[PDB]
Amino acid sequence: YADEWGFSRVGADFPPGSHPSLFSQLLPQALFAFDARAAVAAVAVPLAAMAAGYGWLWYMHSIAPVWQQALCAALIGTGYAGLFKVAHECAMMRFIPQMPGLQAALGTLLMAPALYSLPSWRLHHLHHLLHTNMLWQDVWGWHPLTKVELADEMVRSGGSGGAAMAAARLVLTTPIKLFASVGHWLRSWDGLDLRHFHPASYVEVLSGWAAPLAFAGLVLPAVVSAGGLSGFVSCYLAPWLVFHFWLSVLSLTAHTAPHIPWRAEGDGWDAGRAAVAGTVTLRLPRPLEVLLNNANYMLPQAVAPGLPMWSAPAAYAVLAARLGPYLTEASMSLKLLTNHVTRWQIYDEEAHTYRPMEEVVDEIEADLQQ
């Protein structure tokens, strides 16, 4: 039984030795095309939702109720999450391959409101793709708090207290866990350090950092100059938090479950066993899938990194008809969120048993030093 957590269709077991691009031959070449209508719709529909939300905001600024403001901010954030999915496709060089210059300009312009960098984003996501579900190396992803590290900050820091034993107890036990993409965004700046990067890409990395810096130095002072704090929380900060909620939810539901293990390299980690067996496809209602620009279908993009975004549900239908028992699906519901918040918090590296924080602390607490 694995629908005890809303994980509906669960996967049994995958043989090792396989590479995810291996399954690209299961996808016919009709999906790897350019539909200009689909591209224009994918840019325009979330932009239409954002424009409708902002027109509502200029209609009723402060005379509106809090819940009406929250609903409008949620609509704007979902539209910008769809636009950020478009920018992610542009970063992956698979939105408009005919015009790389327009692709890069569009991706940078659509990632500037998120205070994200296109080259840093594609670098970190290529790192995550090459190190999917691999311990101590992927970083750019929902790397779980292992009981070894909780034990380290549990005994090597003394008792049960500690800075990383209070910050972790605040983040991975509370619904602020569904906003940890803010922490990922803070980590994505790489300390504004060029020494992490190749010396032959310094100008690209600097420009990719400068365009969100141009946004935060030009547009954001114009927002605070046109409404103050009340005109900044409701116009930018709440859509920003909604977009980060969507990014956190998609990233957390992609590669985290009790039946998906995290193994370091040389221990038995494999690319196929981590990609087409370690991915849970989130399923959303069709207006949400259109507004999010099919950002919950990341498995066919993983197995074929040239497959465009609009063909992702069709290619996932092909892959679910072909592979069969190896895939995992999960509908979007309160069950998955409450399980990710209250139950799946600590990953013991012994039987992939995501457990509550206290129950594991109890082990390393009433034992080890005792």
Partner 1 sequence: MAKDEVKARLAPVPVYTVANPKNEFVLVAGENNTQLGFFFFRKEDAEALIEKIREENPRLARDSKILRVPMDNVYEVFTTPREQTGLQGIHFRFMPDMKQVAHALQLYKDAGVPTRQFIGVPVFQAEGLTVTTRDMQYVPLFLCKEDLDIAVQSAYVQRNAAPLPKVEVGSFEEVVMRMTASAGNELAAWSQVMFVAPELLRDS
Ligand X SMILES: CCCCC/C=C\C/C=C\C/C=C\C/C=C\CCCC(=O)O
Nearer to partner 1, 192 or 226 (CB): 226
From 58-66, 92-100, 125-133, 247-255, give the range in contact with partner 1 by CB under 8 A. Answer: 58-66
61 lies in the binding site for partner 1 (CB under 8 A)? yes
Nearer to ligand X, 25 or 187 (CB): 187
60 binds partner 1 (CB under 8 A): yes
Selection from 112, 118, 76 nearest residue 215 by Cα: 112
Inter-residue contact 87 to 110 (CB < 8 Å):
yes
Stretch that binds partner 1, among 55-63, 146-154, 165-173, 331-339 (CB under 8 A): 55-63
Whether 337 and 319 have beta carbons less than 8 Å apart is answered as: no
User: Exposure pattern of 1-28 as b/e (b: 16+ CB <10 Å)?
Assistant: ebeebbbebbbeebeeebebeebbeebe
Instruction: Tell me the H-state helices in the chain.
Output: 36-59, 66-91, 100-111, 118-130, 147-151, 163-171, 181-188, 202-224, 230-232, 238-254, 271-275, 286-291, 299-303, 312-322, 334-342, 357-366
Q: Which does 88 bind (CB under 5 to 8 A by kind): partner 1, ligand X, none?
A: ligand X
Q: Is 352 among the residues that bind partner 1 (CB under 8 A)?
A: no
> In the bound complex, what is the minimum distance in angstroms from residue 200's beta carbon to ligand X?
26
Q: Give Cβ neighbours of residue 362 (< 8 Å, ≥ 6 apart).
A: none
**Interacting stretch for partner 1, rule CB under 8 A, among 56-64, 129-137, 169-177, 362-370?**
56-64
Strand, helix or coil for residue 82: helix
- Phi, psi for 229 (deg, rounded to 5): -70, -35
Contacts of 277 (CB under 8 A, 6+ apart): 11, 13, 14, 260, 326, 328
Give min distance, CB of 65 to partner 1, in A.
Answer: 11
Q: How many CB atoms lie within 10 A of CB 335?
A: 15
Smallest distance, Å, CB 45 to partner 1?
28
Nearer of residues 65 and 101 to partner 1, judged by Cβ: 65
DSSP state of 327: -
Which of ligand X, partner 1, none lies near 63, with the C-beta cut-off 5 to 8 A by kind? Answer: partner 1
Angle at alpha carbon of residue 103, lines to 102 and 106, rounded to 5°: 80
At 207, which amino acid appears? S
Measuring CA to CA, how many Å separate 191 from each of 29, 30, 92, 187?
Answer: 42, 43, 23, 7
Q: Determine, following the binding rule CB under 8 A, whether residue 63 of this chain makes contact with partner 1.
A: yes
Residue 181 binds: one of partner 1, ligand X, none (C-beta under 5 to 8 A by kind) = ligand X
Give least dist CB 239 to partner 1, A: 22
- Are 168 and 360 spatial neighbours (Cβ–Cβ below 8 Å)? no
- State the nearest-atom distance from the C-beta of 367 to ligand X, in Å: 26
Rg of the chain over Cα atoms, rounded to whole angstroms, equals: 21
65 binds partner 1 (CB under 8 A): no
Q: Considering the rule CB under 8 A, would residue 127 count as an interface residue with partner 1?
A: no
Shortest CB 54 distance to partner 1, Å: 17
Q: Which is nearer to ligand X, 125 or 259 (CB)?
A: 125
CB nearer ligand X, residue 59 or residue 136: 136
User: Could you say whether residue 351 binds partner 1 (CB under 8 A)?
Assistant: no
Residues that bind ligand X (CB under 6 A): 81, 84-85, 88, 125, 139-143, 180-181, 183-184, 246-248, 250-251, 295
Distance (Å, rounded) from C-alpha 104 to C-alpha 73?
28
Subset of residues 239 to 268 that bind partner 1, contact rule: CB under 8 A: none
354 is in the binding site of which of ligand X, partner 1, none (Cβ under 5 to 8 A by kind)?
none
Residue 59 or 136 having the CB closest to partner 1: 59
Sites of contact with partner 1 (CB under 8 A): 59-63
